Design a protein around this ligand. Structure first.
Ligand code: ZN
Lengths: 49, 43, 49, 149, 159, 49, 126
RNA sequence: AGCAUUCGCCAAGGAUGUUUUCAUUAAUCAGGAACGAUUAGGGAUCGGACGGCGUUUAUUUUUGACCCGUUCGGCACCUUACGAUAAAUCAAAAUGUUUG
RNA sequence: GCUCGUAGUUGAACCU
């Protein structure tokens, strides 16, 4: 089961519509949306935390 | 943001030119800018 | 309220002529639908992200 | 200007493709439904925004029209025609409970205030009037020699 | 010639003889003309429409006079729309059928649009300079063209 | 048709150079129009003429 | 010389989609172009079109359109290798389509396998 | 490579416009030869054609110089790149990081 | 230094 934090979908959405295919493959509704609660939306510190 | 700022500046300069040649091409009452919306009205 | 084809919501008044406030993010792409809630306090945004 | 913080948030995990039609219940305040570009419509409650109340892959291309009826039921238009859904049923029915395709490429849809009636903006330059629970085919009203969408 | 003429085809030819004697003061197309062919179908419902056909290379011979000729035909016969059309024996054939339907003002542009499925509608724009009775007869031109040739077109003055 | 004005123009330029054979840029205009003689003589010979 | 009316028209679709325009104007028309827009319109990636002849094609487009394809060497493709070809063209097989030239018409690859026909790859769009 | 007095002659050539025609003649280059799809528009530059809610030629019609609009066709500036990418090159090296 | 140019290379749409 692959898990995709809201920092990670946040950073892919901050990357522009060049990556709309990577966003549309990243929001596969099969997958566990792991909601984070911290101010940064910074994925590397969310993952190591 | 940056693209909306640039593009509304471009719309300011473009409408400045279009109103400039509108006033020259007038020069060589008016019609109100709200009346320049209704093109025609069918019964 | 108007949702633009580019990345912006425009908050207007009935008798204003120019925009009372404007709304944007980096993660909001092309706002196709924007509607109010049923008290007139909040505004609700469906985009192309 | 210092306390201009306009952004509350986000209706959960959102859709996959872009939200191209959404609607509100004029009698409630928290029934929010939105149909993306996969046909999949979702129904949220504004109190419980971490997840959607209801979800169905309603259509194939996109969802063009979307509205709530006066009782609790919703309606969706797409190129495949128009479907009437029950989003609030205790047996949670992923299947539709009515449909219409006699008409054309229905491209939007709007619903009456008091009485159970709605109109749809078609592709034949026409609007269709349905009065629910006692109408099979809607009455057609169009401008007489009118062609455009 | 080609046809065993109808009673109303010899009512039209009888109107041609009534434009051979006891008439104008003009006969350039009225003196040589005989019977050719005619059909007569409703415009929706309420009133019918009358069409005749054309021996093919003589269309400039029917450009000898058509203005006020159709006025005399609409006065003297049945108060309905009278229309000339060239029968032949498909692309420029039926495009030529359209340009023979709307004869005074030529076609400006064919606008065949589609809807958000496989559906599509043809709608050709005609020039603005004659509108007075053309907005009346334009429904008759469209429904005559689909009742005779077979496809679905609509006509419009551009904007 | 066109070919007679081509050879009128070309033989006219030839007569000009026969009046002065040291005008080498008009000699380049001659090799341009002679190249058009090879061109349209070739193609309109392969039509059948 | 650019004899490729399809490559020109689809450059207009691409560049005037990244531009953020909302209808394009394609004056060099075809029937491969009109049927190509029948397919993309049927899958909703372009809004609508309208051809007004002089051969103008006016395409009211929506905005999700990422990239429409430019394959010039139009190869024959087996129905058994069509999975390999579609998984090489599309960035994800459930996103976008591959325009096939078949004897039963021109349609997407999923409908081509709904009619059990193998054809020729000309396009892709996603 | 180049082109600077006036005037005449000789032919070409460009651009515009037409109510002009054989109608694929088209497009790029081994072999060879002469000379040394849009950017995104704005403000200016002329070379025409059309129009004038204007002066002056003009003793008044032509007519031309000025001013304006449309319009093509080019020689360059400026920003953003529509992007790029080998960088020093860019309205093109835009199409070599989802290559057809 | 640029230009014409051949083999070659790619060859407008339109017509069950
Ligand atoms: Zn986090």
């Amino acid at each position: 089961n692959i898990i995709i934090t809201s920092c990670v979908m946040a950073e892919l959405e901050k990357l522009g519509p060049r990556y709309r295919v990577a966003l549309m493959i990243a929001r596969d509704e099969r997958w566990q949306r792991l909601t984070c609660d911290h101010k940064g939306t910074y994925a590397d510190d969310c993952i190591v935390d | 943001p940056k693209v909306v700022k640039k593009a509304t500046e471009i719309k300011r300069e473009e409408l400045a030119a279009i109103k400039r040649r509108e006033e020259n091409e007038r020069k060589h009452k008016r019609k109100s800018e709200r009346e320049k919306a209704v093109l025609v009205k069918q019964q | 309220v108007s949702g633009s084809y580019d990345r912006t919501i425009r908050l207007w008044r009935r008798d204003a002529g120019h925009s009372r406030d404007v709304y944007h993010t980096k993660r909001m792409q092309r706002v196709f639908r924007t509607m109010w809630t049923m008290d007139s306090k909040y505004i609700l945004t469906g985009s192309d992200d | 200007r210092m306390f201009a913080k306009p952004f509350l948030g986000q209706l959960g995990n959102g859709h996959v493709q872009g939200v191209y039609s959404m609607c509100k219940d004029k009698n409630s305040l928290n029934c929010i439904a939105s149909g993306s570009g996969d046909g999949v419509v979702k129904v949220w409650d504004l109190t419980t925004r971490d997840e959607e109340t209801w979800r169905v892959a309603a259509h194939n291309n996109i969802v063009k029209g979307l509205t709530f009826t006066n009782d609790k039921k919703l309606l969706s238009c797409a190129t495949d025609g128009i479907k009437l859904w029950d989003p609030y049923a205790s047996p949670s029915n992923t299947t539709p409970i009515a449909t219409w395709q006699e008409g054309g490429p229905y491209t939007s849809l709007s619903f009456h205030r008091s009485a159970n009636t709605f109109a749809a903006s078609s592709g034949q330059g026409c609007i269709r009037i349905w009065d629910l629970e006692h109408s099979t085919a809607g009455q057609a009203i169009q401008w007489p020699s009118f062609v455009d969408t | 010639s080609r046809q065993n003429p109808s009673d109303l085809e010899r009512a039209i030819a009888g109107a041609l003889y009534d434009l051979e004697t006891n008439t104008a003061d003009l006969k350039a197309a009225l003196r040589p003309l005989q019977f050719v062919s005619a059909r007569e179908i409703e415009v929706g419902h309420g009133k019918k429409a009358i069409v005749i056909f054309v021996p093919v290379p003589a269309l400039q011979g029917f450009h000898r006079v058509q203005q006020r000729l159709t006025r005399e035909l609409e006065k003297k016969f049945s108060d309905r729309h009278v229309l000339i059309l060239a029968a032949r024996r498909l692309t420029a054939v039926h495009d030529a059928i359209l340009t023979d339907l709307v004869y005074p003002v030529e076609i400006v542009g064919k606008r065949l649009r589609t809807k958000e499925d496989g559906s599509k509608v043809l709608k050709v724009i005609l020039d603005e300079k004659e509108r007075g009775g053309v907005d009346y007869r334009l429904d008759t031109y469209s429904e005559v063209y689909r009742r005779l040739t077979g496809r679905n077109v609509t006509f419009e003055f551009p904007q | 048709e066109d070919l007679y004005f081509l050879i009128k123009k070309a033989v006219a330029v030839r007569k000009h150079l026969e009046r002065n054979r040291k005008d080498k840029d008009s000699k380049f205009r001659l090799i341009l129009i002679e190249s058009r003689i090879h061109r349209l003589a070739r193609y309109y010979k392969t039509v059948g003429v | 010389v650019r004899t490729s009316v399809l490559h020109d028209a689809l450059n207009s679709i691409n560049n005037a989609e990244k531009m953020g325009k909302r209808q394009v104007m394609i004056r060099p028309s075809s029937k491969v172009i009109v049927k190509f827009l029948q397919v993309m319109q049927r899958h909703g990636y372009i809004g609508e079109f309208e051809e007004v002849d002089n051969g103008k094609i006016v395409v009211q487009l929506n905005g999700r359109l990422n990239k429409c394809g430019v394959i010039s060497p139009r190869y024959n493709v087996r129905l058994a290798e069509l999975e390999k070809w579609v998984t090489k063209l599309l960035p994800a097989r459930q996103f976008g389509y591959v325009i096939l030239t078949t004897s039963a018409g021109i349609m997407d690859h999923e409908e081509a396998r709904r009619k059990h026909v193998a054809g020729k790859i000309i396009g892709f769009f996603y």
